Design a protein around this ligand. Structure first.
Ligand SMILES: Cc1cc(-c2nc(Cl)cn2CC2CCOCC2)cn(C)c1=O
Length: 127
């Protein structure tokens, strides 16, 4: 099998803006999730070849991961905060689609997802 190319992270033709929400998403939400003990399986795309998961990208057609989200924020890929939040949600959902209740990775996703909701809770207001 093969991995797909990673999701796009920097589009120089898209318009760019810096908002308090986008800065919060990178410096508070992402950063705190990134440094969690269980972040490491979510910091880059699932390498289905190295992990020997030949069905991964047969089942998961909208892959996402925190490495991609990080790069997207750093490169102003997101205009709206909701695009970023959607990517996080996609990342977690993928995990629950592919994996079984009680799997280590599922428990790790639950931890990160709880912490995510804690942090988005205090997201600054929209301009
Ligand atoms: C199926 C799958 C694998 C991995 C993944 N990335 C790395 Cl690096 C290692 N692993 C697999 C182990 C991670 C620690 O728990 C045990 C499985 C990540 N995600 C989100 C998945 O859905």
């Amino acid at each position: 099998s093969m991995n797909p190319p990673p999701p796009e992270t920097s589009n120089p033709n898209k318009p760019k803006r810096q908002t308090n929400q986008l800065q919060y998403l990178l410096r508070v939400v992402l950063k705190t999730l990134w440094k969690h003990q269980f972040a490491w399986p979510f910091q880059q795309p699932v390498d289905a070849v190295k992990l020997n998961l030949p069905d991964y990208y047969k089942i998961i057609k909208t892959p996402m991961d925190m490495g991609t989200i990080k790069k997207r924020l750093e490169n102003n890929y997101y205009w709206n905060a909701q695009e970023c939040i959607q990517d996080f949600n996609t990342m977690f959902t993928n995990c629950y689609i592919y994996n079984k209740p009680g799997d280590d990775i599922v428990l790790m996703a639950e931890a990160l997802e709880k912490l995510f909701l804690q942090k988005i809770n205090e997201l600054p207001t929209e301009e």
